[PDB]
Amino acid sequence: LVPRGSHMKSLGYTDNYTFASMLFDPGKLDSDDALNSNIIPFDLHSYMSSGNRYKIDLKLDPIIAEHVTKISANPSGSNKPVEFVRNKDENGNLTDTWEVNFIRANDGLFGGLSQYTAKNGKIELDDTVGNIISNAGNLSNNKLNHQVFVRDSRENKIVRTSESSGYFLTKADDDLVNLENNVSTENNNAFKASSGSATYNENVGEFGGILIDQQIMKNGIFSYSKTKANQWAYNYQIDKDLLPYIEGVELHQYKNYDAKNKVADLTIDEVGNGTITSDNLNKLIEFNNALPETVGVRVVLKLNKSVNNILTKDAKYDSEGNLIRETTKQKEDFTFAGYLTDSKGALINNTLGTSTLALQDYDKDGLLDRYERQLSLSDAENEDTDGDGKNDGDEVVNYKTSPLVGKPQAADITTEDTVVSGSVPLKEGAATQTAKVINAEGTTVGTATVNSDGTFSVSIPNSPEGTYTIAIDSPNYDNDEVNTFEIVDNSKLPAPSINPVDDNDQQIVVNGTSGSTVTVTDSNNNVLGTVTIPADDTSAAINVDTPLEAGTVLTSTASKDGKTSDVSDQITVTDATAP
Ligand SMILES: [Ca+2]
Ligand SMILES: [Ca+2]
Ligand SMILES: [Ca+2]
Ligand SMILES: [Ca+2]
Ligand SMILES: [Ca+2]
């Protein structure tokens, strides 16, 4: 079982334009009959143009997933079921996603753009649906969500164009249930099924946007043409909780966003509902008249502020303006619906599509999972990716520093030294950094490019004694990561420093004044190595036979001209594959 209080990692996206959107078409959960069954039936529809690389993934609401004993469906053109297998994550924890091969010839669901339907789908449960969903909250506000997509099993990513979502209809969805129960006679066999997808697009407007794309698959070659008086209407429902974040709502003709595709401004009422019609609906919706191609409809929600502000609603901040992580939401689902009606308000058969936007802040740092993956490149499952003690959102928003660049470190030097040597933690997405040595009055006295491993060697003049700043400058952030170090009287012997060492490193890099000899010992004072720092540098290398075990603690002292320095700050060897 999936235990209480567990959360699922979201998946990144990959592109593969050969996969059309999949459409999960379940039975409704809105009757005593349906509620007294232990089966939720479904069909699965898709369009396809070899191998087991690409999988079909079905992800079910936890209320449902907790009770699932078996999921199966007949491949297209067959009457023999194939069974879905419950996925496990990057370790051995169960997810709420069930998986089956895509291609029927590879024991999958589709095949022998063509249209295929896998029929007789059955979600089998260990109790009745009614007993299961009677242990839920307000199903008007928290829906029973579903999502379907093709997963690239080589990359563990979602094929962007395959994704579809929605929610099961219950008695709580009374307006949509009444629509399903009052189907129009007009073009009653035109459409086979409909589903939606809701995504975030940073390129919409100035704050990004939400795209709500509905697909309506055809049974044949439907052609829309009505008199002015018999024109249909398009109807849409926008989750009321998004309304504080929406600047405008637009209809686009319809995967990339392009403002040139705008065909109307849309209005919504106080609960997020709207309707649009026309003297010729062909001007607003591309019905692909007399072609078999799926009808697409796009609704665009232009945000009025960063998408990262939604789950942080009601968030509190400390004295220094940093997010109190306990005050933000870790996830939030928003639901949407769209459908066509005839001129009397009756539902055009099979044109009702729902969708779910599943926003997540897995690590409660204020940056949505998908924002971290697509924009900042910070880790979506670590609230402090670089380890510097400033959390990712705070860094992007408050400090305006890179969340991929930790705190620089530089050993003290003397007035006779000509190089400031040190290092800084750089995380996998970090840009190319520039290190600067700046005196107390704000004058830059040296600059260099930080190497990819974080080390740097900044050339400086023989410089006046005092407190200096080592600043690490990213091109993507306004502010540098800073630390201070000392340039001391040249009769002094400052403590050296040790660069970070992991259990894959055969060498220990040390920094210290030129001509001093630096000796490194572990917690048991075993001399692991000694090196004299050369005449025109302030860093040197120690070589060891075998790398050090993760957890061993390192210190160092330097000696020169009869002086012995204080001990360096300790350095702990880390695991070479821990981020
Ligand atoms: Ca739910
Ligand atoms: Ca986050
Ligand atoms: Ca993070
Ligand atoms: Ca940080
Ligand atoms: Ca940082």
From TrEMBL:
Binding site for Ca(2+) 3: 361, 363, 365, 367, 372
Residue numbers binding Ca(2+) 6: 386, 388, 395, 402, 405, 481
Residues that, per the record, bind Ca(2+) 1: 61, 142-143, 145
Protein's cellular compartments: Secreted, Cell wall
Lineage top rank: taxon: Bacteria
UniProt binding sites for Ca(2+) 2: 288, 293
Chain residue ranges for the region called Disordered: 375-396
Protein name, per record: Biofilm-associated surface protein
Originating species: Staphylococcus aureus
Whole-protein coverage range: 362 to 947 of 2276
